[PDB]
Design a protein around this nucleic acid. Structure first.
Ligand code: FES
Ligand SMILES: [K+]
Ligand SMILES: [Mg+2]
Ligand SMILES: [Mg+2]
Ligand SMILES: [Mg+2]
Ligand SMILES: [Mg+2]
Ligand SMILES: [Zn+2]
Lengths: 197, 74, 126, 294, 54, 170, 53, 108
RNA sequence: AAAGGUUUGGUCCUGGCCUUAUAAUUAAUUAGAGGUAAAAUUACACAUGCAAACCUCCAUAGACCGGUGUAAAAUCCCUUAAACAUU
C-alpha cells in the first residue's frame, strides 16, 4: 500500500532533462521498447483499463505506469509530444503506444489543455471572415424608432391592462352562473408585489 | 387509449360533470382578451396567407420567369 | 401510418434525456406521434438555462410564416413562445396568469405583515 | 475635404501588397495535417513555369488581407417594455431568427428579460448564438482561453504571432473589441522585439504596417526593412505615411524638395521620425555597403 | 399595431429597400372580424347521431 | 487485374467525368456507327469511351445503338416536342463529337449549379436530429448548454427524484 | 403480383351494412327522447351536462 | 526486412502462397529493380515535379535531367490503358472492407 | 486481413478446416454505490384493476396515441388523375 514517491511531482518537466531519463530512454520515446502480451496475432482493440489498482501494479505495466517519475501533466510538453504524431498532429490511439485506457484518457486531456494554453503547438487553418459584408446599418443591429405606446408608457395593446368590466356585465354573469360563483376580483396590483422574505 | 368498442369502466359510472366556478370580474376580462387576441392573430394569419400567394405567383409568372422561358426557346 | 383527417400543426416535440428536456419546434400533421413523423423542423427550444443564464429559443420565422399562411394551427405552448419573442401578441392566459400571481403575492405580503404585527403584539407582551 | 485613405483603397492595397512580399516557400509551407501520398507529373520547362505561375496566383488569394474595421458600437435598443410579465419568469429568453437566407448582421436576435423588457441582443449575444445555429469551422461558442494575456505571452515567446492572428480571425469578428485588442497586442509585441519578419509573406503584414502608420511608429519597420536590403519597400512605407498624414511636416517637406526614392526616407528621419538618428545610420550603412561592394 | 418584433422587421425592411418613412405599420381588422361564439351555426352541414342503441 | 480492355472505364470517377448533361427536351439518342472503316474511327471511340459517361449523367435518356446499317456514322436526338436533331460525326474525333453535342443540346454550367443549390434548400445546420440528416442530435452537445445526464450527472436539485422527496417533505 | 385475390365477402358486407342503415334510420322522436327524472337519453344513455338541467 | 533496410512507411499485401523464401526473394527482387526519380528524369529528359496536398499547388522539383532538358511534352492520353487491380479499385467503388482491415495495432 | 496453425520421410503447389478481432442473447462462477440508455421466449390461454371523453341538450372525439410482426416477394423510386371522413 506504499507506492513510490516521485521527487519531480512539483516540476514534472525536470525529469525529462535529468541524466536518469537519458540513460533509461536516450532519445527514443518512452514507449519504444514496450511490448504487449496477448493471445493471437491480432491484438485486442482496447488496451487494459488500468495498470494500477489500489497501489498494486499489473504484470506488464504500460510505458507511463511502469515509470512512476513520468507524470502526465499539461505543463510537461516534452512528454506529451511523444504521444502526438509530428507529421499529422494526431494523438495516437492507445493500442499504438500500449498505454492503458486510464492514462490514455489522461494523456488526451493534458495534450488538449496544453494546446489551449499555447504551450503545445498545433496547426491553425486559415479561414475567411464569417460575413461577406460588414455593414451595421440594418435595423436588426441598429435603433428602431420607438413605438408610440412605448414613448407614452402605455401597454402595447390596450387589453394587456386590466379594464374594469361594466357593472351591468358583471350582473349578467352572476345570473348565468348563479349558484357556482367566486368572490369578485378587483384590479390587480399595479406592479409585482416584492416577494416576502 | 381505449377504442369505441371497449367497455366503460365500472369505477366511473357515477361520474357527473362538476363545472368550474366562475369569477365574474376575471371571466369577463378574460373573455374580451380572447376575442381581441384572436382578432389580431387572424389579421396576421391573413397577411401571412397573402405573402405565400404573392411569392408563389412571382415564381410561377413573374418577370424573370417569362424571360428565361423565351430565352431558352430562342 | 395512413392518416385520414387532421390538420397541420406547429408544436414542440420533446427530446433529450431524463431530467434534461429539449424541444424541437416542428410542423407536423396533428395525428402523428409527438416525436414521430413531421413535415418540417421550424426551430428548437432549450428550456434549461445555459452558462449565461439564458433559455435559448430558435425560430425559423421565414418558414413559420409560410406554414401559418397555409393553415397550420399552433399549440398553446408555441403561442406562448411566439408571444414572448414579440412575433405574436402576448397570449390572454399569459396576462391572466401574471395577474393571478400578482394577487397571490399581495396576499402573502399582507399575511406576512399581519404576522409581523402579531409578532409585534408578542413583543409588546414581552 | 480630401478623403482619408482606406485600408481597401486600390492604392493602399498596392503598397501594402508590395511591402508584404511573396515567398512561395513560406506561403505554402507544409501543414501539419493528415497526409496523403504525393503525386508526380513530368513537365517541361514551359509547363513548370506555368505551374509556378498558378502557384503565384493561388499565393495571392492565400495572402488576401483580413478586414481592418472600426470597433462596433454597442447595441442598446428596447423594442418593448411589457411590464405585465414582470416577475413571471426567472431566466432571460434569447430568440434567434434562423431563416437561412439572411446575412448574419441582418438577423433579428431579441431578448425577453425577466423584467418584461424586449430588447435587441448585444454583440456578445449575437456572435454566441450565431455560432450555435450557424457553426463556422474554427470558431467556438465560448471565447477560447488562449487569448488571455498570460497565454498570449506564451505564444509570443514561441514566435507564433501568425497563429495568434489566424486564431483571432477564426474566433472573433473583425470589428469586435476582442479582435482589435488581440491584433493590437500582437503588433505591439512585434514592434518592441523587432520581429517584423515573422509576418512577411503572410496576410497579416498589411494590418501590422497599417497600424504602425496610423499610430505614427513606422520607425522600427523602416530600420528593419533597410537592414534587410528591402529599401524599395521602405520607400513605399514612407509614401503610405505621407498619404495618410498629408498635413504632416514630413509630407510637406517632401513636396517642397520633390523627394523620391531614398530621399523620401531621409526626409522622414529629419522631420517626423521618432528615432531619426538610427534611420539615417542604417540607411547610410546600407548605402556604404552597396557602394563599396558594388 | 403590429406585434413588437413583427413591427421592427417591417420597418427594417423599409430602410433596406430604400423606402424612407415614419408611418407606423398597422394591421387591418375589418377583413377578419369574428362572429360571437353563440352565433347560430349551419345545421345543414351538422352531423346526426347513429341508430345503434347503447 | 480488372478484366476487359481499359478497365478504368468501370470506375465511378471515370463515369463522373462526363460533362454532357442533356436538356430536359432530349429523350432518345440513337447511335449509328460502323465497326469497320477509316472515317468512323472517332465514332467507334465515342461508343467505347463516351456513351458510358453520357448515360451515367442522363439515366432517363434512352441510348440505343445500331451497327453497320448505313454507310456513314451519325447521331440522331429525339426531343419531347417531336423535333429530331441529326448530327453527322464522320471524320470527327470522339472528343469533337462530345463537344458538339454539349453545345447544341447540353445544359449550361449556370443552370446545373442553380439546381444543385435548390436541392439542399431544406437542410439547415441549426436543425437537430439523427446523424443521417443533421449535425447534432441534441442541444446537450452544444458548448455552454447543460450536458447530457448520461455523460455528466445533473445537479440533485434539477432531478425529479429529489424534487418529489421535497414535495412529500413539505 | 397477381396473387392479391378478390374479397367478395368484404364487398358484400359493406353494401349489406349500408343498406340496413338506410332502412332502419331512427327518427327525431327516438334520438332526442328524454327521461326527465334522470335527464338521460334512452337511445344512447347519455346524461345531459349539469349546466343544462 | 523493411526495418533492416530502413524503410519506415509503406503498405504491402501478400497473396497466393506464403512461402517465406519466395516472399523474401520476391521482395528483394522488386525493391532492387525500382526506379528513382532521377533515373526517370534522365530516361525521359523531363523535370519530375511533386504535388503535395498539404503544400497546395506549390510545384516541388524532385529531379531534373542531368543532360539536356527536352521541349516535347510527355503525351497525356485522354483515357489511360493502365491495368488496374480490382482490390485497390474496389475501395473507391464504395464496397465494404473486411472487419480485419485497418484494425488498431501497435506501432511498427 | 499485415495474417497465423494444420496434409508429407521431406520439399513445392493446390485446397478445406480452424485460430487471432467485433457485437448480441443465454448459462456457470462472482459483484458495492451512483447517473444514463434499453428491457425482448411464445399471433399460446388469460383471473382482477385501469387505458376516452368532453360539454347548456345538438354535435365533435373514442378512425388518433399505444401494441404486435399476422399475412405477403410481398417493395423502392417515379408519373398521372381525382377527390379528402380535413385545415
Ligand atoms: S442526448 Fe442530449 S440530453 Fe441526453
Ligand atoms: K492454409
Ligand atoms: Mg356549442
Ligand atoms: Mg441471465
Ligand atoms: Mg404508433
Ligand atoms: Mg410470418
Ligand atoms: Zn498503465
Amino acid at each position: 500500500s506504499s507506492l513510490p514517491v516521485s521527487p519531480y511531482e512539483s516540476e514534472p518537466w525536470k525529469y525529462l532533462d535529468s541524466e536518469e531519463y537519458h540513460n533509461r530512454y536516450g532519445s527514443r520515446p518512452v514507449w519504444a521498447d514496450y511490448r504487449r502480451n496477448h493471445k493471437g496475432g491480432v491484438p485486442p482493440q482496447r488496451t487494459r483499463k488500468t495498470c494500477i489498482r489500489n497501489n498494486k501494479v499489473a504484470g506488464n505495466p504500460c510505458p507511463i505506469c511502469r515509470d512512476h517519475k513520468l507524470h502526465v501533466d499539461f505543463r510537461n510538453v516534452k512528454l506529451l509530444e511523444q504521444f502526438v504524431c509530428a507529421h499529422t498532429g494526431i494523438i495516437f490511439h492507445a493500442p499504438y503506444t500500449g498505454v492503458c485506457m486510464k492514462q490514455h484518457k489522461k494523456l488526451t486531456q493534458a495534450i488538449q489543455k496544453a494546446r489551449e494554453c499555447g504551450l503545445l503547438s498545433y496547426y491553425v487553418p486559415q479561414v475567411e471572415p464569417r460575413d461577406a459584408d460588414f455593414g451595421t446599418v440594418h435595423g436588426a443591429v441598429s435603433v428602431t424608432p420607438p413605438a408610440p405606446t412605448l414613448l407614452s408608457g402605455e401597454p402595447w395593446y390596450p387589453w394587456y391592462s386590466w379594464q374594469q368590466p361594466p357593472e351591468r356585465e358583471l350582473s349578467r354573469l352572476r345570473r348565468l352562473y348563479q349558484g357556482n360563483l367566486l368572490e369578485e376580483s378587483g384590479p390587480p396590483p399595479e406592479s409585482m408585489p416584492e416577494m416576502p422574505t | 387509449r381505449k377504442t369505441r368498442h371497449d367497455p366503460p369502466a365500472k369505477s366511473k359510472v357515477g361520474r357527473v360533470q362538476t363545472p368550474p366556478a366562475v369569477d365574474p370580474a376575471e371571466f369577463f376580462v378574460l373573455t374580451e382578451r380572447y376575442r381581441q387576441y384572436r382578432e389580431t392573430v387572424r389579421a396576421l394569419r391573413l397577411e401571412f396567407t397573402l405573402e405565400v400567394r404573392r411569392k408563389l405567383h412571382e415564381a410561377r409568372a413573374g418577370v424573370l420567369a417569362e424571360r428565361k422561358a423565351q430565352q431558352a426557346i430562342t | 401510418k395512413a392518416y385520414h383527417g387532421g390538420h397541420l400543426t406547429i408544436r414542440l416535440a420533446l427530446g433529450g434525456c431524463t431530467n434534461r428536456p429539449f424541444y424541437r419546434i416542428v410542423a407536423a400533421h396533428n395525428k402523428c406521434p409527438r416525436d414521430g413523423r413531421f413535415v418540417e423542423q421550424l426551430g428548437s427550444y432549450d428550456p434549461l438555462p445555459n452558462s449565461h443564464g439564458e433559455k435559448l429559443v430558435a425560430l425559423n420565422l421565414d418558414r413559420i410564416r409560410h406554414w401559418i399562411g397555409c393553415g397550420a394551427h399552433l399549440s398553446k405552448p408555441m403561442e406562448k413562445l411566439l408571444g414572448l419573442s414579440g412575433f405574436f401578441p402576448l397570449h390572454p392566459m399569459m396576462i391572466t396568469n401574471a395577474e393571478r400571481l400578482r394577487r397571490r403575492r399581495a396576499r402573502e405580503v399582507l399575511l406576512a405583515s399581519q404576522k409581523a404585527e402579531s409578532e409585534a403584539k408578542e413583543t409588546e407582551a414581552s | 475635404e480630401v478623403k482619408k485613405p482606406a485600408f481597401m483603397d486600390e492604392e493602399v492595397q498596392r503598397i501594402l501588397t508590395k511591402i508584404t512580399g511573396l515567398d512561395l516557400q513560406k506561403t505554402f509551407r507544409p501543414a501539419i495535417q493528415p497526409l496523403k501520398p504525393p503525386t508526380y507529373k513530368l513537365m517541361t520547362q514551359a509547363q513548370l513555369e506555368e505551374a509556378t505561375r498558378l502557384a503565384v496566383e493561388a499565393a495571392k488569394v492565400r495572402l488576401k488581407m483580413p478586414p481592418v474595421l472600426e470597433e462596433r458600437k454597442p447595441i442598446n435598443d428596447v423594442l418593448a417594455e411589457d411590464k405585465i410579465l414582470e416577475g413571471t419568469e426567472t431566466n432571460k429568453y434569447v430568440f434567434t431568427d434562423i431563416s437561412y437566407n439572411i446575412p448574419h448582421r441582418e438577423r433579428f436576435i431579441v431578448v425577453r428579460e425577466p423584467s418584461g423588457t424586449l430588447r435587441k441582443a448585444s454583440w456578445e449575444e449575437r456572435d454566441r448564438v450565431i455560432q450555435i445555429y450557424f457553426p463556422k469551422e474554427g470558431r467556438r461558442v465560448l471565447p477560447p482561453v488562449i487569448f488571455k494575456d498570460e497565454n498570449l505571452k506564451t505564444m509570443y515567446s514561441q514566435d507564433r504571432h501568425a497563429d495568434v492572428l489566424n486564431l483571432c480571425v477564426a474566433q472573433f469578428e473583425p470589428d469586435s473589441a476582442e479582435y482589435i485588442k488581440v491584433h493590437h497586442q500582437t503588433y505591439e509585441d512585434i514592434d518592441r522585439h523587432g520581429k517584423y519578419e515573422l509576418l512577411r509573406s503572410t496576410r497579416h503584414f498589411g494590418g501590422m504596417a497599417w497600424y504602425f502608420v496610423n499610430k505614427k511608429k513606422i520607425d522600427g519597420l523602416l530600420i528593419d526593412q533597410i537592414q534587410r536590403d528591402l529599401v524599395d519597400d521602405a520607400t513605399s512605407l514612407v509614401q503610405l505615411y505621407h498619404m495618410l498624414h498629408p498635413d504632416g511636416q514630413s509630407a510637406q517637406e517632401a513636396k517642397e524638395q520633390a523627394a523620391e526614392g531614398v530621399d523620401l526616407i531621409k526626409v522622414f528621419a529629419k522631420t517626423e521620425a521618432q528615432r531619426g538618428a538610427y534611420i539615417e545610420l542604417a540607411l547610410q550603412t546600407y548605402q556604404e555597403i552597396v557602394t563599396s561592394h558594388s | 399595431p403590429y406585434p413588437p418584433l413583427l413591427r421592427a422587421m417591417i420597418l427594417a425592411e423599409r430602410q433596406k429597400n430604400g423606402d424612407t418613412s415614419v408611418q407606423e405599420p398597422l394591421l387591418n381588422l375589418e377583413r377578419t372580424r369574428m362572429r360571437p361564439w353563440d352565433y347560430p351555426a349551419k345545421q345543414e352541414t351538422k352531423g346526426r347521431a347513429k341508430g345503434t342503441p347503447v | 487485374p480488372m478484366k476487359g480492355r481499359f478497365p478504368i472505364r468501370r470506375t465511378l470517377q471515370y463515369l463522373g467525368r462526363g460533362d454532357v448533361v442533356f436538356k430536359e427536351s432530349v429523350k432518345i439518342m440513337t447511335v449509328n456507327y460502323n465497326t469497320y472503316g477509316e472515317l468512323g474511327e472517332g465514332a467507334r471511340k465515342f461508343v467505347f469511351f463516351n456513351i458510358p459517361q453520357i448515360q451515367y449523367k442522363n439515366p432517363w435518356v434512352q441510348i440505343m445503338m445500331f451497327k453497320n446499317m448505313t454507310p456513314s456514322p451519325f447521331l440522331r436526338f429525339y426531343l419531347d416536342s417531336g423535333e429530331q436533331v441529326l448530327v453527322d460525326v464522320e471524320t470527327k474525333s470522339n472528343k469533337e463529337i462530345m463537344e458538339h453535342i454539349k453545345k447544341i443540346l447540353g445544359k449550361k454550367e449556370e443552370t446545373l449549379r442553380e439546381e444543385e443549390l435548390e436541392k439542399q434548400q431544406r437542410f439547415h445546420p441549426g436543425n437537430f436530429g439523427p446523424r443521417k440528416y443533421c449535425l447534432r442530435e441534441c442541444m446537450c452537445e452544444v458548448e455552454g448548454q447543460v450536458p447530457c445526464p448520461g455523460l455528466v450527472p445533473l445537479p440533485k436539485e434539477m432531478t425529479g427524484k429529489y424534487k418529489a422527496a421535497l414535495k412529500a417533505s413539505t | 403480383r397477381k396473387k392479391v385475390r378478390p374479397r367478395l365477402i368484404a364487398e358484400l358486407a359493406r353494401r349489406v351494412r349500408a343498406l340496413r342503415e338506410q332502412r332502419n334510420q331512427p327518427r327525431d322522436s327516438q334520438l332526442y327522447a328524454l327521461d326527465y327524472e334522470t335527464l338521460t337519453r334512452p337511445h344512447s344513455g347519455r346524461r345531459l351536462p349539469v349546466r343544462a338541467w | 526486412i523493411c526495418r533492416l533496410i530502413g524503410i519506415k512507411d509503406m503498405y504491402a499485401r501478400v497473396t497466393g502462397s506464403m512461402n517465406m523464401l519466395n516472399l523474401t526473394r520476391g521482395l528483394f527482387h522488386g525493391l532492387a529493380r525500382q526506379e528513382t526519380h532521377q533515373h526517370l528524369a534522365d530516361k525521359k529528359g523531363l523535370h519530375v515535379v511533386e504535388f503535395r496536398e498539404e503544400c497546395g499547388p506549390l510545384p516541388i522539383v524532385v529531379a531534373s535531367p542531368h543532360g539536356a532538358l527536352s521541349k516535347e511534352p510527355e503525351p497525356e492520353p485522354e483515357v489511360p490503358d493502365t491495368k488496374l487491380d480490382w482490390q485497390d479499385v474496389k475501395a473507391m467503388q464504395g464496397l465494404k472492407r473486411s472487419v480485419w482491415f485497418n484494425l488498431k495495432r501497435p506501432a511498427t
